[PDB]
Structures are given as structure tokens and as C-alpha cells.
Design a protein around this ligand. Structure first.
Ligand code: SF4
Ligand code: SF4
Ligand code: FES
Ligand code: FES
Ligand SMILES: [Fe+2]
Ligand SMILES: [Fe+2]
Lengths: 634, 634
């Protein structure tokens, strides 16, 4: 019964194919892992020194405490902090890569890269205090790249990709609690230090450290978006398609998978130049498709169709038509390298610190980006030739996707209703009730949850109650694959007030129809775009973020990066739902801090709820409490 | 039967007292943890995402692979890499603290701190390429502190506290394999990134990353020693005592515990000024004693007696005479805060990122160091007053300890036998067989091993075979508490050739007797001093470190810091014994790399051996293989 594994019908069809062919999947590896360890599930396990492993029974008798004396609340808080630091290390490493790429580009060392969005470059420079008047663009960009790199270490200022992106009143709240990061890698290292044996052993102190490290993660996200927009262009509305039916039996199908547009953006451009070489090999052309966030990046900027996401990534290979899978880093199931032996796909790694045994490695260098891309795409063309005459099974299933809603694009769309005060039309309709509030869906799928079931169940309940829904990452992936980014579904999905607003904006932008039911704001680093929108609304209203009717939902969370994002959503002031259990329930004191008493520190809080209907009710209650706090009807 | 817990008789006596008083100890918490989880013991557990916990059966049937596809060798290598990064985060955080302290001192912001060792300052400056001619000392020091801080991030040079401290030929070997760190916190963050879900998944690639991060740890160690020597003085030979009998019923007994001399050095000086205030309270004075590495720091520089170490730290409190325990960070069992409720001890934390629930916190600031020290010591005096008329049980057990053998001190001692070529007398006696080789004992005690049993068993076997033995950290602690730093024990412990050499050096230095059987080279960061000595020998001989008859033994290892140290010992070219099982045996491929094929990369290798007699035989075989490689008899 494949609908217990995934609610996506294309995924179900490929699970049937994998089963009859004897190809083990993520769902099979999960079944083989059951029952999972309940010490790990509850957070009551520690391996931070060679006296371990230590564990604590959630209930009953001994063991009650770690060998060194570490209590349940210390063990739980230390493990959580390490997860936050690991997420911060991923988002900001991504950002550091892009900062080095921009520096190389403007120093004449990588001519495949350039300043594509000069408007974005100048606005970032102004936000940071970098002078622009009478400066060459390449010198402004060099200063921006140097400022980005400087935020990784201690200096005379705090992390500017925190303090220049939130309103002063929020910065003041955070500073009063010691939560502003001093440097991105500085905080990651401090976490690893304080959580090592015989160091920090006070749950509140540990968790304050975690909140601060989560803001280092936010800075890496915001830096990643800023730099990718400079290099590759700020997204604007675009129309494309999603799901496995975007693969084409007659073409060389190339998936870009992983995270950084420094890689996927060049593949997209070079693939167009290699069309005739692909035709010489018997193909119609090169069909680049997206998986995971790298896919989101090229979907947002270029309309490249999204093949699949997260938990179902192996299924693209099961079709038999995926000639290459080009990988950077993060969220790539290493099973892809073994499955490729069965399906024929050429899996190619490109980054020095992210290799997979059995996959071909092609060192990417920005200085040689075009030549490296051609070498990679020629491996793909060779693989296509090997499947001449082989039948494939591509499910004929795809949805229409309108996307590209950067914060700049949302403001521009609203400006068609009020040119000199673009945020006011949105605020007006929150006040009059046509928009109840805003919910950001973020983060992964997780094999424990039938794929997409929480995202779609929650989104349906909120849309019917007139909530404006925005989405990133594989939450955007889930919603796009189920039709939530097709404006043809507005009538079925949206309450009357929300429909009226989406229609007024869309028609004022010439569409003759509404905006889509859900606004796709991009990749996981592009959660920073939602921060920019919410901060702009707070500044326009003269209130802090913890008074706005805005919530977040990591409805099917998996990666350490999603834990970090959820934690900074709480830290900036949002009620934040998580739809899978993080390893915290073994400590009531820690759970109480994260779901209740953190409200008194930052105004945000976690809502841990595995039942999606109940989660939607709790998210609506959180929105309505904010409305009442502003004196609004609800 | 307390000798199964500790071979230290003072510890045994306090275990009997804890038992009759119902005070739970580390050994009781260990017993309550048995049997420990064998997935964790073997390394076959992963909690790096919210699909976990995942585990792999070492043998048998499913589960055989992680849910995402992570193999046993990936899971084992990722966990090990995180442990190395966490150790690096501790040693280098320590170093960063000292760099900020030096900067503040020379900028006029902390007058309790100063340049105490001008010779060391100028030599470090010269080693780094910083000009000294016609510069003020405060400006040279500012440049040294800024260079230290710069090594934490990427810049135009690699980490100079690696590349300027090893011989060029070793740097070249490491560079050829990509192992030179680019920045200390940069590498820590890269590790956390590459080991997060869906990133690096090739065991060799992961382990190369770990070796590089271990060199970031070495840099933090060497930086810590350098900066502590500038601020507090380079050690020279000193005589003191060790074990619980250094406590005095009639005095205010104050333990300094944790790591950084920025704290313990001021306590020592201020305590002398407060003698009359202590006498006013009915005490004879303030008796400062050491625990763990902070204790080693003040023992090496000032002859402060060492009370206890590592695993037995709770026993100092059980005496009833410990009025205060002043903590910084690292290796402090958090049980001390609960035990204090029973024993009366005032436990005081001082660092913002290392608090313990139930312990009094007194914020230390360098700018207020003397005033903070007096506040702390007045809490101790008040506590002494509360135990007026209370009997105490201080075991009347202590050993004589000769220590203070910095590398500068060892060279100076040798220079009395050859003034213009001080290393030659040591080399001469290696060649003629009076010295078989050199063994460094490093790292912790571990509750799994009867306390000190591996250190003493191995040391006895090596000393009888004419090995020169040096020691740091709680390996030095174990050996000092069992008489291995008392020159009166040379006749009993040392082979005839080693005795002849220790006697010739000692008599040439005026002692009328030998150097002690083991040379104490200091704290855990001061393992860097052993690197300086070995590098100087390599440079004098014109060979790389992997040709010298030098080995290391982390005979009872516990902390993530000890894993990092063991790993950089392997990376710089040494055969390196570890006497407890690291979580690697669940993967034969990983174990084979770490114990065998790494020899072909760095020339070093791990020797995993839990039986100490067998470990000594394997260490001697490793020394003798090096002798034969140099064409020497053995
Ligand atoms: S840090 Fe404490 S709780 Fe964790 S493994 Fe070590 S002894 Fe056990
Ligand atoms: S990273 Fe892979 S092996 Fe580790 S917990 Fe997640 S699914 Fe399991
Ligand atoms: S005891 Fe299972 S996660 Fe450690
Ligand atoms: S299953 Fe015990 S350490 Fe995870
Ligand atoms: Fe992602
Ligand atoms: Fe130590």
C-alpha cells in the first residue's frame, strides 16, 4: 500500500517499480530500522566522551544520570545545540562558497561569473554601510564579499547579516539577552566547546547558546540569498512544471541536486550551448531538471522544472530515464550511488568535501566552470547513448507551478495596488479580515510521515481560513507537486477573502486571474526572504515581529538545517510548528523552555504537534491570538 | 574492593568514605550504566537527522545500513570526525580566550595582565615573521595577538600555528595530501557541515578531513601554550607535591579546576595578598591546590601542589576540607555541584559559556580580575568558617614531584653537557642505546580502566627498557601521584642506560642527583611542547618526524580533546597508542585506515590496545622499528 509511504502518485508508481525490480528504497531501509531506539528518540543518549555511551531511562529506575553527572536536561540540551550548530555549518558554508565565488569573479579570476543584479548589489551595500558613490561596481562587490567573509569571525562589529536585517527593536531585545552572534564560525565552535564533556551543564544557559547559534544560521541563510541574487539574478514570477513527468524519454535528462547555484546555474547555461552535441548523440536536447534546493534555485531564477524533492529523490532514478545526477552537497541520500548501479544513472560529485563512494567525481572549480560543466554533460550524453532502445517508465504526472516570489517580487506585485506604499494593501486586508495572517511552510519531508501529508493537510485548513501561505524548500516542493502553486486551484482551495485578495493582486499585475494559492519564496536559504518580508511589515507598522500574525511550520522536518531554521524562527519572535518529534521529550524542563518559557525571552515558541489537523488548529489559534493582541477581530 | 576502581590509595580511602556516607560517585554512576549500548560502543549509531536514530548491527541481519543509505564506514567516520572537531573547539577556544586577554593587556584594558616572558614574546614574533627591531614590546604583542586571532579564519596564509611549528618537509607531506588547515574555526565548521546528513559519504575523504581538523587542534594547543607562556612565564624546573594529602585541615583549601591560566594564575597571586584576611577568620592562610589542567598550569609555573585529577576529582570534596572549587571549563564532572550539597564545598563557575545548575556563578572579567578573585576567595573564607569544629578526613598521602620541563627547560638542562649543541647529548645517547627512544604519555583517566593502571604498567615496562618518558595532562597526573616524578625512585624504576643519562644531566645541573624518572611537560595544550622538542630533533637530524624513535600513548583516554590530540599525533608522524576503545570497531575499513593505511599518508598510525602489558610490547616494537630504520642497534 504505497499511499502509506507517499501521497504523491508519481512516487507511488515508482515504488511499485522498485519493488518488482528488487531495488531497496529509503522506505525499505526505514522498515528495516524498526523499532528505533527510544533513548535516541527522546534525546536521552550521550556519546560526547569515551566513558559513554550513556543513556537515561525516560521513566523507571537506573540509569538516571550520565556517568560524569550529566542530567537529562543537560544531555537533551547539548544534543540539540550540536544539531543547531551543524545546521548553521551547512547554511553558512554554502554562503561562504558564494562569497569566495563573488570575490573571484570581480578580481578577474572566474569570468563565468559576474554581477548580474546590480540593483541588489547596491541595495546590499547601502544596507551594510558600504559607500557606492563614485565607486566601480567591482570594487563595491569586493567590499560586499569581504564583509560577508568577515562575519564568520570576531571583529569590532557583531554579525551584520543579523543586525542589519532585523528591526532595531528586535536587535535590542536579542542584545539584552546576549543572543546576537559575534561571528558565524565563532558561534559554531563555541557550541561544540560548551557541549563537550565537563563544560556547560545548565539547561537554560545551553539553550541560550543555541538560540544565538541559530541566529548565526539565519545570517548564513540571508548571506546565501543575497550573494546568489547578486551573482545569478533576483527571482521574479515564472511559470514551469513539477513532478516526475517533467522527465523526457527522448532527451538527455540531467538532474541538479544539492544546494549551491554556483554549480547549478552554470549547468543550465552550458546545457543550452550543448544542444547540437546532444542531438548528434540521438537525443532531442538536454533536459535539465531540479531536485531539492539546487532545483529550487534554478526553478526560481530560470523556470527549470522540478523533478522531485527530499525523501522521494531515489524515485527519479527508478524511471530508467535519468542519465545524470549532478551533486554539490547537503540532503543527498548516499543510496543514490548504489541505486545507480541498477538504473544506469551517472552520479557525479563536484565538491571536495562531499564525495560518495562509487560515484564519479569531477572537481569543480569556478575558474574552470564552463569546461567542468561540459565534461559533466558529456558523461551524461554518453549515458543517454547507452540506453538507446531501452524502455523507460516515466509517470505521466506533472503539475503547473507559478513561482519566483522573492520579497522584491511580492512588493512589486503589491505596488500595482498602491505604488508609493506597497505593503499597505496587504496590511489593509489583514485588518479587514480578508487575510487572517501569514504562514510559512519550510523544511524537509521525513520518512516517518507519509510524504507531503502534513504540508497538504495543514495548508488546506489554513487556506480555507483565509491565511496567506508562503513556502520554501521541500515544503514548497510538496505544495507544488500537489497543485498548490497552480492559480487554477484558487477557487477550490481558498477562502473567499483570500481569493478576493489573490485575484485583485493578480489582475492588477495583468494576469487576468489570481496569484497562485501558495507563494513560492525559494530554497532553504531563501527562508531569509520571508524574514525580509516580515521585517519590512514590522518596520512599516512600528511593532516587533512577535506582535505580527505570522507563524511558521516545519511540518515534516528532517535535517539539522531544519532544526536550526525552526530555532531562529522562534528566536526572531514567531510561533513555530514542528511536525516530527525532535529529540527533546526525554526532558520536561527542556520541552517547557522551548514550547513555553522562551515566549518571555523572544516572544516566539515551538508548537510540537504530530497530528496535522491538530497542528492546523494550533497554528490558527496562534494567528488569532496575535490578531487579538493588535485589537483586530478574528 | 576499591583497588578495582582506582590504584591510588588516597582515592581508595575516599571511596570508602563516600560509600558509608551514601554519596554517589562516578564509579557508582558507571556501574548503574552497565551494560552499555553496544551500537554506541562500536560506533554504529547515527543521530544526525530526525529520521533517526539509526543503528547497524555489527554482525547478523538487518539493520545493515542507515535510513538515508549511510554505510557503517560512513557512520563511523562521521562520528569520529565530530569528536575531533569538538576537541579542536575546546583547545582552540582556550587559545582564543588567551589571545583576547593578551590584546586587552597591551591595550591598557586589563592591568592585572602583562608581558611576563619577553624572551618568549620575541621568539614567537620571529617565528611568525613579525618585525621586532625598533618596535615597542606592547606593539609586538599586539601583532602576535592579532596573528593568533587571524588563524581562526581563512586569509591569504594557512594556519601559521601549524606551518611555522613543523619542519618544512613535514609541512610538504601534509600539503601534498591537502591536510594543512585554512583556519581553525573554519575547519571545525567544515567538519560539522560535511558530516551532516546527505553530504560527505566516503570514508577515506571523511577521515582526511578529520586529520586536517586535528591539525587545527594542534594549532590551538600550540597557540595556547605560546600565549600562556608570554602572559604567565615559561616553566622551569620546580619541586612540589601531589595527591590529597596536600590539603590542610587548618587552612582555607581552594581548588582551581578546569583549564585556563587566565583564571588560575590570578587566584594564586591574590590568595597570597589575602593571607591576613584568612587568618582573621581562624585559618592559617589560603592553600591553593590544583585539579586537572588548570592545576597543571599553576604547578608548572609556580609549584602549586596538585590535589587530584580527572576521574577521581570528586574525592577531593569527600575529605570535607575543600572549602571552594573554582571552575573555568572542560573536564569538570557536573556531579560536583550536587556533591557540594553534602560536603559543604562552594563550587563557583566563572565563564559565561560554562555554568552548572546549583553552583554559584561569579562572572570573571579580565578587566576586573583582582576584584573578582577577592570576591571568590571571600566566599571560600566564609565556607571555611562554617566548618570550624568539624573533623575532616584528609588521607595523609602525598608524593614529591619535580616538574616544570618546558622544552626550553629541557634544552637548557641538556646545554650543561654541550653548550653550543644542546640536542646532541640526547641524540648521542639514543645512538649508543642508553636511551632507546621517547614516549609521551597524554590524556585522561577513564572510569572503564582502574585509575592509573595503564599509565603505570606501561611506563614501568618502558623505563626498564631505557625509554625516556615525558608526560602531560592527567597522564602526568597519574605518574606524579605514583612517584614517577620523584628522583629518589630512579634506581628502582629506570634501566641502567636511562639512569646513567638522567644522572649525568641532573648532576651537570647541580642537583647532585638525577632528573626524575618522567619529565612533566605540562597541561594538555602543552602536548604542543612535546611537538616543539620532536620538531627540533627532526630539524637537527635532517629527517622527518616519522623516522624518529618517538611514540605517544593516550593510555586511559576519555575526552573529545584526547581523540583530537591522538589524531594529530598520528598526522605529524607518530605511532600513537590508545588504551580505551574509540567508537570505530564497528567498521573494519575505518579501523584498517586508522591503524594501518594511514602510515602511507602521514607515517603515523594508531595502536588500539586495551591490555597494558601488550600495549607496552607494541610501543617498544614501534620504537625499535624506528631505530632499525635509522640503522641503529636495538
Ligand atoms: S559526557 Fe558524560 S554523559 Fe556524555 S558520554 Fe561522557 S560521561 Fe557519559
Ligand atoms: S543521517 Fe542517515 S543514518 Fe543518520 S540519522 Fe539521518 S537517516 Fe539515519
Ligand atoms: S542508546 Fe540508542 S541512541 Fe544511544
Ligand atoms: S542505539 Fe545506543 S548509542 Fe544509539
Ligand atoms: Fe535544502
Ligand atoms: Fe585538560
Amino acid at each position: 500500500r504505497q499511499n502509506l509511504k507517499s501521497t504523491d502518485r508519481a512516487v507511488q508508481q515508482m515504488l511499485d517499480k522498485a519493488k518488482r525490480e528488487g531495488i531497496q528504497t529509503v522506505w525499505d531501509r526505514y522498515e528495516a530500522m524498526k523499532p528505533q531506539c527510544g533513548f535516541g528518540e527522546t534525546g536521552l543518549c550521550c556519546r560526547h566522551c569515551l566513558q559513554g555511551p550513556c543513556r537515561i531511562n525516560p521513566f523507571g529506575d537506573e540509569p538516571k544520570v550520565g556517568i560524569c553527572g550529566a542530567t537529562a536536561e543537560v544531555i537533551v540540551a547539548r544534543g540539540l545545540d550540536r544539531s543547531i550548530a551543524a545546521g548553521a555549518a551547512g547554511h553558512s558554508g554554502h554562503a561562504k562558497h558564494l562569497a569566495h565565488t563573488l570575490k573571484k569573479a570581480v578580481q578577474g579570476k572566474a569570468a563565468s561569473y559576474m554581477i548580474k543584479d546590480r540593483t541588489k548589489l547596491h541595495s546590499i551595500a547601502k544596507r551594510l554601510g558600504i559607500p557606492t558613490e563614485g565607486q566601480k561596481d567591482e570594487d563595491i562587490a569586493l567590499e560586499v564579499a569581504k564583509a560577508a567573509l568577515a562575519d564568520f569571525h570576531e571583529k569590532d562589529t557583531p554579525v551584520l547579516w543579523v543586525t542589519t536585517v532585523l528591526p532595531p527593536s528586535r536587535v535590542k531585545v536579542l542584545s539584552a539577552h546576549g543572543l546576537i552572534p559575534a561571528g558565524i564560525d565563532h558561534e559554531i565552535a563555541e557550541i561544540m566547546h560548551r557541549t563537550s564533556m565537563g563544560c556547560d551543564a545548565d539547561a537554560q544557559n545551553l539553550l541560550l547558546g543555541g538560540l544565538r547559534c541559530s541566529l548565526a544560521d539565519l545570517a548564513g541563510c540571508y548571506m546565501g540569498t543575497d550573494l546568489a541574487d547578486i551573482l545569478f539574478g533576483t527571482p521574479a514570477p515564472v511559470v514551469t512544471e513539477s513532478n516526475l513527468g517533467v522527465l523526457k524519454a527522448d532527451a538527455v535528462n540531467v538532474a541538479v541536486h544539492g544546494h549551491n547555484p554556483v554549480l547549478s546555474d552554470i549547468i543550465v547555461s552550458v546545457s543550452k550551448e550543448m544542444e547540437n552535441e546532444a542531438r548528434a548523440a540521438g537525443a532531442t536536447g538536454i533536459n535539465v531538471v531540479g531536485i531539492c534546493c539546487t532545483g529550487n534555485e534554478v526553478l526560481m531564477r530560470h523556470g527549470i522544472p522540478a523533478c522531485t524533492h527530499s525523501v522521494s529523490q531515489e524515485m527519479a532514478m527508478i524511471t530508467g530515464a535519468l542519465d545524470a545526477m549532478i551533486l554539490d552537497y547537503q540532503c543527498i541520500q548516499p543510496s543514490v550511488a548504489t541505486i545507480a548501479e541498477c538504473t544506469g544513472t551517472t552520479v557525479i560529485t563536484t565538491m571536495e568535501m562531499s564525495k560518495i563512494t562509487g560515484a564519479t567525481h569531477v572537481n569543480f572549480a569556478e575558474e574552470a566552470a564552463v569546461e567542468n560543466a561540459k565534461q559533466i554533460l558529456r558523461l551524461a550524453i554518453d549515458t543517454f547513448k547507452r540506453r538507446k532502445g531501452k524502455p523507460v517508465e516515466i509517470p505521466n504526472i506533472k503539475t503547473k507551478v507559478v513561482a519566483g516570489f522573492s520579497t522584491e517580487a511580492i512588493i512589486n506585485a503589491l505596488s500595482k495596488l498602491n505604488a508609493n506604499d506597497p505593503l499597505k494593501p496587504l496590511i489593509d486586508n489583514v485588518v479587514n479580515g480578508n487575510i487572517r495572517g501569514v504562514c510559512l511552510f519550510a523544511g524537509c519531508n521525513n520518512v516517518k510521515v507519509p510524504q507531503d501529508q502534513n504540508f497538504t493537510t495543514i495548508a488546506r485548513k489554513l487556506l480555507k481560513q483565509n491565511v496567506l501561505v508562503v513556502a520554501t524548500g521541500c515544503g514548497a516542493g510538496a505544495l507544488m507537486r500537489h497543485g498548490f502553486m497552480d492559480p487554477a486551484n484558487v477557487d477550490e482551495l481558498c477562502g473567499d477573502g483570500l481569493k478576493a485578495v489573490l485575484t485583485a493582486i493578480g489582475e492588477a499585475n495583468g494576469l487576468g486571474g489570481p496569484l497562485p494559492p501558495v507563494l513560492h519564496m525559494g530554497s532553504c536559504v531563501d527562508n531569509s526572504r520571508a524574514v525580509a518580508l516580515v521585517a519590512a511589515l514590522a518596520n512599516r507598522l512600528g511593532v516587533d515581529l512577535d506582535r505580527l500574525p505570522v507563524v511558521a511550520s516545519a511540518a515534516e522536518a528532517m535535517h539539522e538545517k531544519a532544526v536550526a531554521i525552526g530555532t531562529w524562527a522562534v528566536t526572531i519572535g514567531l510561533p513555530t510548528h514542528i511536525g516530527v518529534l525532535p529529540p527533546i521529550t526525554g526532558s520536561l524542563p527542556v520541552t517547557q523552555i522551548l514550547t513555553s518559557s522562551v515566549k518571555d525571552i523572544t516572544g516566539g515558541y515551538f508548537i510540537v504537534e504530530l497530528d496535522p489537523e491538530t497542528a492546523a488548529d494550533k497554528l490558527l489559534a496562534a494567528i488569532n491570538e496575535r490578531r487579538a493582541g493588535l485589537g483586530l477581530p478574528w
